[PDB]
Amino acid sequence: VQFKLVLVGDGGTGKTTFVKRHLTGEFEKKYVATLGVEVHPLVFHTNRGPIKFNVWDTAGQEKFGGLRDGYYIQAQCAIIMFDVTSRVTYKNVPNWHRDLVRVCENIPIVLCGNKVDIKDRKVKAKSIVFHRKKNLQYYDISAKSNYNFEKPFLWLARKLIGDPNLEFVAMPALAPPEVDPALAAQYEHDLEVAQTTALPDEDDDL
Amino acid sequence: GSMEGILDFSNDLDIALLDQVVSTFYQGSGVQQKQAQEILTKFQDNPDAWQKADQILQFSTNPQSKFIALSILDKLITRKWKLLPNDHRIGIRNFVVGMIISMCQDDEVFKTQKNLINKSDLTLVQILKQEWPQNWPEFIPELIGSSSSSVNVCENNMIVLKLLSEEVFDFSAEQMTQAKALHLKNSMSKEFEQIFKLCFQVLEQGSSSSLIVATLESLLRYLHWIPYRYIYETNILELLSTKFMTSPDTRAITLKCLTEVSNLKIPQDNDLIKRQTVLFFQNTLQQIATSVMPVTADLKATYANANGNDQSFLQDLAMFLTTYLARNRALLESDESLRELLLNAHQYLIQLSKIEERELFKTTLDYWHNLVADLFYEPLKKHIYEEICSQLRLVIIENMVRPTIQLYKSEREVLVYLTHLNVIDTEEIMISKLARQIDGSEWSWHNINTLSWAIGSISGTMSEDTEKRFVVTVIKDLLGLCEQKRGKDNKAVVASDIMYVVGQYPRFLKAHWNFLRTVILKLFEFMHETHEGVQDMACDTFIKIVQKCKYHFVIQQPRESEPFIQTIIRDIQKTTADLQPQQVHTFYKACGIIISEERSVAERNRLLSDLMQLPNMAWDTIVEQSTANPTLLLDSETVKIIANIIKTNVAVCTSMGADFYPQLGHIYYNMLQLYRAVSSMISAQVAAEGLIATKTPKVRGLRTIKKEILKLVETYISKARNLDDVVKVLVEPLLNAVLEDYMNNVPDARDAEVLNCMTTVVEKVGHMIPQGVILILQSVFECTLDMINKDFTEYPEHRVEFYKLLKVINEKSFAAFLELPPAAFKLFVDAICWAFKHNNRDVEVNGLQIALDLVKNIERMGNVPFANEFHKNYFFIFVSETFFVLTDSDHKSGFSKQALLLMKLISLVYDNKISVPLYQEAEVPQGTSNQVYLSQYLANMLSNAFPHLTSEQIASFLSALTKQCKDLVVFKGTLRDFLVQIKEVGGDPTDYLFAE
Amino acid sequence: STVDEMTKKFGTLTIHD
Amino acid sequence: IHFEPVVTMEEDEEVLYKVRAKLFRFDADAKEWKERGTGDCKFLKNKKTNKVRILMRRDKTLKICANHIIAPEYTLKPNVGSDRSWVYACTADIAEGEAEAFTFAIRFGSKENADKFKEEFEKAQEINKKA
Ligand SMILES: Nc1nc2c(ncn2[C@@H]2O[C@H](COP(=O)(O)OP(=O)(O)NP(=O)(O)O)[C@@H](O)[C@H]2O)c(=O)[nH]1
Ligand SMILES: [Cl-]
Numbered sequence A: 001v002q003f004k005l006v007l008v009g010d011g012g013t014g015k016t017t018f019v020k021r022h023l024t025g026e027f028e029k030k031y032v033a034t035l036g037v038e039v040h041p042l043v044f045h046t047n048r049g050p051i052k053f054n055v056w057d058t059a060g061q062e063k064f065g066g067l068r069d070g071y072y073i074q075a076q077c078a079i080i081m082f083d084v085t086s087r088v089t090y091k092n093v094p095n096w097h098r099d100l101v102r103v104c105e106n107i108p109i110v111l112c113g114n115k116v117d118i119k120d121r122k123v124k125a126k127s128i129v130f131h132r133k134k135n136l137q138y139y140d141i142s143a144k145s146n147y148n149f150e151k152p153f154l155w156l157a158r159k160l161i162g163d164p165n166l167e168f169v170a171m172p173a174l175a176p177p178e179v180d181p182a183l184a185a186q187y188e189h190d191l192e193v194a195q196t197t198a199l200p201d202e203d204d205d206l
Numbered sequence B: 001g002s003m004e005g006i007l008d009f010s011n012d013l014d015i016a017l018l019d020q021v022v023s024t025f026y027q028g029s030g031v032q033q034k035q036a037q038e039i040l041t042k043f044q045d046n047p048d049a050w051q052k053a054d055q056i057l058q059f060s061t062n063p064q065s066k067f068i069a070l071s072i073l074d075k076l077i078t079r080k081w082k083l084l085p086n087d088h089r090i091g092i093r094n095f096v097v098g099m100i101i102s103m104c105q106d107d108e109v110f111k112t113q114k115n116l117i118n119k120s121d122l123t124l125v126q127i128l129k130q131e132w133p134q135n136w137p138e139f140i141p142e143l144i145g146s147s148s149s150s151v152n153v154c155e156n157n158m159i160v161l162k163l164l165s166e167e168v169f170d171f172s173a174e175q176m177t178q179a180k181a182l183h184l185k186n187s188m189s190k191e192f193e194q195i196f197k198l199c200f201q202v203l204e205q206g207s208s209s210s211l212i213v214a215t216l217e218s219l220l221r222y223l224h225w226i227p228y229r230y231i232y233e234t235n236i237l238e239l240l241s242t243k244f245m246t247s248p249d250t251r252a253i254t255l256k257c258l259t260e261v262s263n264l265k266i267p268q269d270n271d272l273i274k275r276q277t278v279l280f281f282q283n284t285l286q287q288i289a290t291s292v293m294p295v296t297a298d299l300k301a302t303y304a305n306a307n308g309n310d311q312s313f314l315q316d317l318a319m320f321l322t323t324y325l326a327r328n329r330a331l332l333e334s335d336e337s338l339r340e341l342l343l344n345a346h347q348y349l350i351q352l353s354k355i356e357e358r359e360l361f362k363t364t365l366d367y368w369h370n371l372v373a374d375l376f377y378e379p380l381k382k383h384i385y386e387e388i389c390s391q392l393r394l395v396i397i398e399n400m401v402r403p404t405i406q407l408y409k410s411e412r413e414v415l416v417y418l419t420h421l422n423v424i425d426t427e428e429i430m431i432s433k434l435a436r437q438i439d440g441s442e443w444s445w446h447n448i449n450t451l452s453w454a455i456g457s458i459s460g461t462m463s464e465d466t467e468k469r470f471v472v473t474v475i476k477d478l479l480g481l482c483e484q485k486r487g488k489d490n491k492a493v494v495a496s497d498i499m500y501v502v503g504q505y506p507r508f509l510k511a512h513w514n515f516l517r518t519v520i521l522k523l524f525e526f527m528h529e530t531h532e533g534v535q536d537m538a539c540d541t542f543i544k545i546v547q548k549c550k551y552h553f554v555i556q557q558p559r560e561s562e563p564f565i566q567t568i569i570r571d572i573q574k575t576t577a578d579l580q581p582q583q584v585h586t587f588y589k590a591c592g593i594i595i596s597e598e599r600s601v602a603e604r605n606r607l608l609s610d611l612m613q614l615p616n617m618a619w620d621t622i623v624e625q626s627t628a629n630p631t632l633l634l635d636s637e638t639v640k641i642i643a644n645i646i647k648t649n650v651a652v653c654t655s656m657g658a659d660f661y662p663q664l665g666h667i668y669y670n671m672l673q674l675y676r677a678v679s680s681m682i683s684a685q686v687a688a689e690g691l692i693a694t695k696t697p698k699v700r701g702l703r704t705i706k707k708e709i710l711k712l713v714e715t716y717i718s719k720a721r722n723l724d725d726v727v728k729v730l731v732e733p734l735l736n737a738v739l740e741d742y743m744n745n746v747p748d749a750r751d752a753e754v755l756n757c758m759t760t761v762v763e764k765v766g767h768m769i770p771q772g773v774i775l776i777l778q779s780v781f782e783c784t785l786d787m788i789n790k791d792f793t794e795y796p797e798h799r800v801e802f803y804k805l806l807k808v809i810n811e812k813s814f815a816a817f818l819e820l821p822p823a824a825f826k827l828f829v830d831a832i833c834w835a836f837k838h839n840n841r842d843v844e845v846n847g848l849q850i851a852l853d854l855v856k857n858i859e860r861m862g863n864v865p866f867a868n869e870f871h872k873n874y875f876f877i878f879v880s881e882t883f884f885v886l887t888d889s890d891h892k893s894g895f896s897k898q899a900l901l902l903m904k905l906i907s908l909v910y911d912n913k914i915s916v917p918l919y920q921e922a923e924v925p926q927g928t929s930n931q932v933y934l935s936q937y938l939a940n941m942l943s944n945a946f947p948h949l950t951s952e953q954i955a956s957f958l959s960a961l962t963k964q965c966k967d968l969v970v971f972k973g974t975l976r977d978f979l980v981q982i983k984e985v986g987g988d989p990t991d992y993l994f995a996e
Numbered sequence C: 001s002t003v004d005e006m007t008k009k010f011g012t013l014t015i016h017d
Numbered sequence D: 001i002h003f004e005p006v007v008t009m010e011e012d013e014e015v016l017y018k019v020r021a022k023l024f025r026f027d028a029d030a031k032e033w034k035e036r037g038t039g040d041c042k043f044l045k046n047k048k049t050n051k052v053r054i055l056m057r058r059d060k061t062l063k064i065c066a067n068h069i070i071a072p073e074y075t076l077k078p079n080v081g082s083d084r085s086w087v088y089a090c091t092a093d094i095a096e097g098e099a100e101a102f103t104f105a106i107r108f109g110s111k112e113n114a115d116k117f118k119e120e121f122e123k124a125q126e127i128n129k130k131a
């Protein structure tokens, strides 16, 4: 049970960072522009069984657009992303939506306003109304603070499975194995480096 | 690998190979997929791939391959169409039109390859945008003709027309020049009478649902721009509001059409028009009640069940009802025969407002705000809606959100209006709701929180006597509810809600001192409670009440022996003993609010000294100790003590501002000496341990001391009223303590907060310290610029504060830049342009404003050597650098300010405000005007930067741009037109005559 | 007096059984 | 009369310790720490074997970001930049399936919680030494 998801939006809005957070748990602080598209399987465990999203993370920068709307063919769901600290990225939401629904004429779509962790918000909550007439779900999100970061996938899972009571559930925790004096020095070397590399974001609550 | 064969154009294109790449991309996975992706992008981006497009479209059996072929053609049509030999243009048109016909004639293809047909229709529309109607006057007539021979062709023609309308009226503003947009809009308007006839015939006769839906979809687009007579002088409203609301396949689109009809430009005079507007609403609501669901239906449950497209339909119904009623409900409020319709429509909205869906609730709430505001002001209206409003009261009270912030303010506003409209009804609902908390029928943490937020939200709406009875009843009932419950968890929830309600009724507190004192003393008790959240709630409520009731803490109340602020300060140690540092600072800040209400200077200063007794004693001690042994400052406990002392001073200074000066004077000199001592320790640690030292807890604690010292000085100076003292007492020791330390630290040890502190100093007293501002620049300018001029990412905070500082220096003490040696002034200009190129708005905006202010500063100097040399050296640098970010597609966020700067620069020459030739004696004949030279420079600059533009395009653009340099709106339109034309070949140079 | 009754009651507010 | 009426794999473990934390893994080929998850870190004692493991799940998604025995050989060591974190080597973690080895760092809300974690971590190492 797998579903193709296309993720679109202006360059710099956090599409790749958002997916990476879901794939590995990491927060990538650097902006390395996506070239064309990157495809990543993403599985969630639910009370209806596993659901797999084949996430097509597309490029938002025009000079790296690749096949552009060719990526949308046979998509079964989508996320449109903008950046609440950048008004132009919201101004372009209708353009991305236009190109998307010309190819995908009746799929569930989530509109996400990312980077709500930043104090100086520029796209105010009351300005965000494009989703209303287009029947898109909307969420404030932050890939950095994880605010609402699961909601886009939870909502899409419920639409794709047709079950409004679907919930994410705890994946089973298999018993871990137990525990080579020849590598005592190789690990103490990697450890010495790790100890002397400062952990990031030491001011965060965690 | 092998798949790369399609990239070899010397050989013929093997279609079967193309599909293996295409299939591998779309249906494959992992490494293979990634490889085919890169191969397809390279194939698609080959500037000759379009030549191989008709091959793919003719011989491929894969719909995705043909889609990609059309994308390749799209790139050609939209960017290089006009460069082609005319034969290719005619040929491309012919085999797109022919392909579309063939696909529509094969019913199996028509129904199974919708994506490919839609892509072909859009490609056709791209050709129409290039060729129609000037080179294709028969398109619309021949389209209408072909429609009659086939339902499939007719349905697809509705898709083409839908896309054409979108491209011309909905998405032309930023994609076409103004002239081309107007040309296509007029052309569609010229032939719409024929288009509408076909559309109406289909709707009136057609029986194919798919054809009907496509026709209605195209109608939705037309309603954005067509004149209202096509809607009101035909029978189309009847069809929309009856026939098409009955079948679910047409219901969704028809409702969207009727929503847009509710927005048409319509005369407000004709009483027959008003009848038609009433009639289609009546018909729509009748169809909903008979074919979809009755007024009584539980839409909350239906929406939650999420069957089929029920959620989208209920969303669309909310949009229809709110849109129509916001504009037209007055049409239904006077006629007795329309009263049931008016109230049934509002009852559907009541039911819709019970749906659990945040964004839909905000849509209905926006409407309710519109209604209850009008009922509050408009004579003789509120009685019509009494039953609607009574239900709404319950809806908003039961969906109150946590004081999300925007939603609460919206809910509060509606509920305040509703309370004024019927205060008795509001009060009875709230007391009843509280009864159902006490009897347990509706009890829960969520439900009692929600009701408490609602009760608190209407403060100020009742008379003081009614409010008194109401507050007493609510608090009594809540107090009994808390006693009734068992367990800290339950009691904490209720006790917190009690304090919330109390803090929302300051009018009550001000009138009942004995009660206010009891509340405060109870909050002080809660400050010893360890249950999670209680202490935060107690401190937050404390400062909230103080902000509103401070006057009653600074006067001596009857039956009391002293102002209560004295009593608070007497016991402050016991009261806060169990609080965390942040909570202690909130407490002290609240005391500072009160103390600043004392306008007897000697009493206020005495209160200030007494409040600061404990921090001052702790301070005096570790100023002695820290001095006798700088090793202490490595003791994390001493460092934390120091930081919390300074943080306490910041908190009190935040609330007292100018009144804080006596306390600042108590610590100021020893505080700056501490700043130096801490500074030496940080440097010593980095020297002994390396840059990694700055990550250690020890150095981070030391830098916190420096940052809080800077924040304290910032906070006071930004609020100071006596600026002579700031200049004569504070500034010199401050600059001596911070500037050299910053300049002579390695980059990783420089505190960006130094720049922020200097910005405040310059802002507040910059005009009084010209030598100090020079010293600031000398110490921070070159060394900070070197930190941030290698990339756009390193040292983000220094970046932002750096340009904030330059901006304020340029505003308040521009003479400081005049003293810079020529080499450093050149770096200043480089720094400004460097700011242009940032995508970071927190830098780009300031960079453009500095540039604009700098040009203005220069202009203000008049005809003098420095201004003349400035234009000779830098005028064209600023012109060209601004043009670069305007046109590079990577700084669209700054367009408005880039345009302003450019218009100012051009207007300088246009008004002969530059007194010297901008050229060199040898470049042009003697006597040449700067106007002529500016146009020649810009013509040559644009020709080399955009070599695909014709000389005529460039000349016409510049002629229009310079003519319009006193009209920003028009100037910006010409820039936008230029940005369109640089994306394609062969743009029409007459486009730049649009304004003229 | 109704305010005084409620105030007395408020004075005994507590969150522990 | 008779009226017929209308018609994780942690269950067998004991929770010795539970604390909110943020887990990092060291990417030695990029020389930087990468977050692996934030959530409740639990020491789970198997009731049959009396062996203790660390099981940690991400908030909301509840996906496992740590699952490995608290081996008595492991040694918690401080990170240069933190007084509320521990660094240690793990030779067999199965959060993502196949047992890999990792250099983990785990950070807590306070030095106090980090020191408690240390205490509990070593107590659990003793538990696992006996079994
Ligand atoms: N403060 C903050 N920064 C974020 C957030 N999400 C992403 N970023 C940052 O935004 C920048 C761009 O992230 P990225 O994922 O590459 O954006 P993108 O939409 O994929 N760009 P592209 O279309 O070019 O691939 C990164 O530096 C990232 O750290 C967020 O939620 N908050
Ligand atoms: Cl007051």
Ligand SMILES: [Mg+2]
Binding pocket: A015, A016, A017, A032, A033, A034, A058, A059, A060
């Ligand atoms: Mg990306």
